[PDB]
Amino acid sequence: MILVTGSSGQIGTELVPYLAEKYGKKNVIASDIVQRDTGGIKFITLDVSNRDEIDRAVEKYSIDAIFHLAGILSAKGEKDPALAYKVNMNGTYNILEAAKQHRVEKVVIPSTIGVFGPETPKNKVPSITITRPRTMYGVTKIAAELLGQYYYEKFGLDVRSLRYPGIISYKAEPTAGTTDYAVEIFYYAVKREKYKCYLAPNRALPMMYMPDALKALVDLYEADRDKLVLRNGYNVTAYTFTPSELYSKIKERIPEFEIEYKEDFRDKIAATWPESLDSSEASNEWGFSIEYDLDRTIDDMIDHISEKLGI
Amino acid sequence: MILVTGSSGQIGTELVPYLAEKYGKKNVIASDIVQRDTGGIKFITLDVSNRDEIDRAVEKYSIDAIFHLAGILSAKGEKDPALAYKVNMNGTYNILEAAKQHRVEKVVIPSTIGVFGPETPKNKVPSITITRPRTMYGVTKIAAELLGQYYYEKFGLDVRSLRYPGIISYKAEPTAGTTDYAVEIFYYAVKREKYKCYLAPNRALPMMYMPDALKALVDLYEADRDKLVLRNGYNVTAYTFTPSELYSKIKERIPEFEIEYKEDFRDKIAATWPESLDSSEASNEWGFSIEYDLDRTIDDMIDHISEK
Numbered sequence: 171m172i173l174v175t176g177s178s179g180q181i182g183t184e185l186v187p188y189l190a191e192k193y194g195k196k197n198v199i200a201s202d203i204v205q206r207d208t209g210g211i212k213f214i215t216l217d218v219s220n221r222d223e224i225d226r227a228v229e230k231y232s233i234d235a236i237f238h239l240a241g242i243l244s245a246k247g248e249k250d251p252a253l254a255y256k257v258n259m260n261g262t263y264n265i266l267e268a269a270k271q272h273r274v275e276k277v278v279i280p281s282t283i284g285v286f287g288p289e290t291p292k293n294k295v296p297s298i299t300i301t302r303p304r305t306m307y308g309v310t311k312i313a314a315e316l317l318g319q320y321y322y323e324k325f326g327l328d329v330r331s332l333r334y335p336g337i338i339s340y341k342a343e344p345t346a347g348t349t350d351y352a353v354e355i356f357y358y359a360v361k362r363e364k365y366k367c368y369l370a371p372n373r374a375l376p377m378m379y380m381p382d383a384l385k386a387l388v389d390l391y392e393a394d395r396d397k398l399v400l401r402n403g404y405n406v407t408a409y410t411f412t413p414s415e416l417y418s419k420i421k422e423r424i425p426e427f428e429i430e431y432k433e434d435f436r437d438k439i440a441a442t443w444p445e446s447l448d449s450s451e452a453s454n455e456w457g458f459s460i461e462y463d464l465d466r467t468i469d470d471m472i473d474h475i476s477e478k479l480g481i
Numbered sequence: 482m483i484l485v486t487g488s489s490g491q492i493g494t495e496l497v498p499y500l501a502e503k504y505g506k507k508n509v510i511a512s513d514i515v516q517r518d519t520g521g522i523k524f525i526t527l528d529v530s531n532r533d534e535i536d537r538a539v540e541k542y543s544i545d546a547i548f549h550l551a552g553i554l555s556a557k558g559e560k561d562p563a564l565a566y567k568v569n570m571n572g573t574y575n576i577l578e579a580a581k582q583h584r585v586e587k588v589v590i591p592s593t594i595g596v597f598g599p600e601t602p603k604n605k606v607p608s609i610t611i612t613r614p615r616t617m618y619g620v621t622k623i624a625a626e627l628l629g630q631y632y633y634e635k636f637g638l639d640v641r642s643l644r645y646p647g648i649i650s651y652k653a654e655p656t657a658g659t660t661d662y663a664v665e666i667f668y669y670a671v672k673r674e675k676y677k678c679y680l681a682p683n684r685a686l687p688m689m690y691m692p693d694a695l696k697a698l699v700d701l702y703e704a705d706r707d708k709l710v711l712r713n714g715y716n717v718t719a720y721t722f723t724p725s726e727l728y729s730k731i732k733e734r735i736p737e738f739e740i741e742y743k744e745d746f747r748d749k750i751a752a753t754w755p756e757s758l759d760s761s762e763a764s765n766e767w768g769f770s771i772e773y774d775l776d777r778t779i780d781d782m783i784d785h786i787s788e789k
């Protein structure tokens with residue numbers, strides 16, 4: 171039995187049916203504080219900041235694995251750091267301790283490039299590097315990785331984690347992160363409208379398409395234990411680009427659309443992060459691989475967003 | 482008005498009178514969940530894990546600065562990680578939130594070499610380095626440094642911190658800490674008794690004497706917030722030695738001294754930390770300096786422990 175927390179978000183909306191198709195709708199339990207249609211898959215209300223709720227869910231459903239997605243992202247976290255701390259820090263601790271106290275075999279946590287800071291090298295950064303995040307989100311996430319590793323080394327609890335770069339998708343709309351523009355821009359492109367970008371035109375960041383993000387999280391989940399040396403904090407990425415570069419590439423398909431740059435607080439967050447990641451450890455230790463390069467995700471996004479908007 | 486949490490500990494026992502001496506007795510307030518003699522200075526019971534208590538104290542005593550010493554150390558943290566997380570993680574968060582809410586203009590947190598892990602270079606480690614701690618204590622402490630820097634960059638709360646190595650002292654009794662062997666060994670030596678050390682004979686670690694530890698904490702506290710760039714995570718040390726090295730030096734003064742090694746979980750903790758630290762940043766930014774080398778610390782300890 172697999173429990174997914176924070177399943178109503180950008181990733182969860184697709185991870186739940188992804189897990190269901192692979193292991194059976196019957197073996198997956200979706201959960202969040204906000205319910206959304208999960209197409210037949212069981213959904214339960216679960217606030218991760220409430221230890222009692224986690225215990226009850228794990229007990230009732232004899233949970234064997236937890237994909238812990240629940241959390242307040244980078245941007246939203248800066249608007250309410252107290253909320254981010256409660257949900258991300260105490261919530262992750264609750265999940266780890268609950269898993270340990272019960273018979274949960276594995277816990278998989280999606281960390282982020284948000285664990286990096288100004289001192290972190292900007293190009294092809296490895297997994298073991300300087301981690302001095304400057305956002306509440308980042309502090310709770312590096313803490314989660316360390317707590318995760320500690321629960322394995324101390325209690326033998328199989329906790330694994332990877333660091334996601336910006337995730338691009340079309341099924342569920344991102345709203346609380348810093349890399350959200352990479353999705354928003356497609357809507358404006360397909361409608362031939364002028365997109366107002368909140369990141370600087372040359373703000374380079376690592377990114378990846380949802381299909382690969384889902385595959386990576388599940389591949390890490392299924393990875394052989396004997397090769398998991400790093401175990402927590404695996405850098406994962408597909409490509410790096412700036413807003414002006416993505417605009418230009420989309421332009422190659424849709425010439426009648428434009429962009430303007432009006433940077434806000436999110437650009438300041440992005441400035442503290444690295445431009446590209448080295449994902450060699452993930453590939454060497456559990457076979458991480460990318461199937462969608464930039465061109466392929468751009469064309470796939472245009473196709474699906476165009477159908478969604480009735481274009 | 483300066484508030485000190487965890488004032489009854491090894492550091493607090495000495496920092497309080499140190500503060501009263503420099504800033505006046507009526508300007509210091511001691512606090513802890515366990516009371517000890519404060520030689521007149523006001524003392525109040527305060528559980529840092531209870532946010533409401535912190536708020537009342539800061540409000541009632543018009544606290545302007547906080548030296549946050551309360552916490553669970555490395556060894557005890559491994560014996561009870563849940564307690565370490567509760568008082569260290571939640572406690573420090575409570576202090577920061579309370580400081581941010583009210584009118585607190587300065588908060589000083591004593592971090593530790595415990596924030597380092599196996600990947601951290603072993604020699605002359607600079608402050609900006611790999612920090613992947615493997616103890617619950619270490620996890621809570623690197624989080625403390627990060628939350629601190631965050632509150633400063635986000636809310637302007639003047640939070641500063643330095644990373645203490647093992648601290649040697651005679652005032653307070655040792656508490657079986659990972660580096661407390663450096664204190665216990667003196668009790669046994671002065672009695673000419675064979676000491677049973679729990680760290681490996683060649684387990685090198687950075688250390689420093691209490692007088693310098695106190696001076697460093699206050700020098701950091703008195704620094705002009707404009708001069709501080711690193712601000713949090715300042716590596717600080719006086720010297721590096723191994724148990725066999727300290728034993729040898731002590732034996733030069735007390736030749737009948739004997740020692741045997743029975744390593745335990747604390748040696749495994751120590752093995753994950755660096756051997757020596759580069760403290761250039763502390764010296765360049767707020768003038769960090771050492772006045773007690775290893776010899777003076779050894780002779781001074783022997784003198785005091787003999788007296789009791």
Ligand SMILES: NC(=O)c1ccc[n+]([C@@H]2O[C@H](COP(=O)([O-])OP(=O)(O)OC[C@H]3O[C@@H](n4cnc5c(N)ncnc54)[C@H](O)[C@@H]3O)[C@@H](O)[C@H]2O)c1
Nearest residue numbers: 176178179180181203217218239240241280282334336337
């Ligand atoms: N999307 C990305 O580009 C990206 C990148 C790196 C890391 N991540 C990580 O992936 C996870 C989810 O990402 P996402 O993009 O789907 O986020 P999202 O903002 O789309 O969804 C987050 C979900 O968390 C839920 N939630 C908030 N508080 C909760 C609580 N107390 N209990 C249970 N649920 C709660 C929300 O209701 C929401 O459905 C997070 O841990 C995030 O840090 C995402």
Ligand SMILES: NC(=O)c1ccc[n+]([C@@H]2O[C@H](COP(=O)([O-])OP(=O)(O)OC[C@H]3O[C@@H](n4cnc5c(N)ncnc54)[C@H](O)[C@@H]3O)[C@@H](O)[C@H]2O)c1
Nearest residue numbers: 487489490491492514528529530551552591593645647648
């Ligand atoms: N002593 C060292 O060598 C050393 C080295 C590096 C960092 N530090 C840091 O210095 C600080 C204190 O060190 P120490 O050696 O004096 O520790 P200590 O163990 O001697 O004292 C800690 C104090 O914390 C108190 N305490 C525990 N829970 C509390 C709570 N909920 N509310 C208030 N007080 C509580 C204890 O009762 C105790 O008096 C800690 O933050 C520690 O991590 C110490």
